[PDB]
Amino acid sequence: MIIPALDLIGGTVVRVVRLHYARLRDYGNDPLPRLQDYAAQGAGVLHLVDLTGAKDPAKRQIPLIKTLVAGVNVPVQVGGGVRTEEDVAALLKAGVARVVIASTALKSPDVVKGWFERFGAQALVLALDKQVASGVSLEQLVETYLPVGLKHVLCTDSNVSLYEEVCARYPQIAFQSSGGIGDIDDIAALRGTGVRGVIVGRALLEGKFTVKEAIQCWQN
Ligand code: NA
Ligand code: NA
């Protein structure tokens, strides 16, 4: 499916370029109408990235998140700075449907495996860049969290070939693709790779296309 996304810093909708990251451009301070229109066009899942809470969890934009969550009627994914069990609970209590676990927390697998046992697997999403650079490869990650029902994995950046393999290898894992979306053809490329969800951010803010077009292309 198509999962529209927004990166937020201090309530400001911004744009970044992720590496092993810096802000590029501001787009405004009214995220809700953008999210509300996204859902109106038929989007079924919305994605949010708390970049503020990412660099410091004490400055987690909880109030904005509960505002945006209650503002739409579709499940909402939030990531960035989720490094402890209380952070997952705090977000769930804010209305968040799925929480994206930071790669930092993966250094303590026994701690993270405890979160899966409590909150369940449908509420957690593990993020990967495919591995984490103490290197955690995709297979090593799967073996670690398959006994606790791993289901959702977020892969971030001509990689259509790789997505064909990983999705065929792990049919029990719903893979989410992030990055590499700047044109309507990029969505058509992942259409038959087995990816269950495509994250689209800057292409919408730039006006390359709309969510309605993205969905029609994806569902074609
Ligand atoms: Na869709
Ligand atoms: Na809501």
UniProtKB/TrEMBL annotation:
Signal sequence bounds: none
Keyword match Isomerase: yes
One Pfam short name: His_biosynth
Major place of residence: cytoplasm
GO biological process, one term: L-histidine biosynthetic process
Enzyme nomenclature, EC number: 5.3.1.16
Protein name: 1-(5-phosphoribosyl)-5-[(5-phosphoribosylamino)methylideneamino] imidazole-4-carboxamide isomerase
Source organism: Salmonella enterica
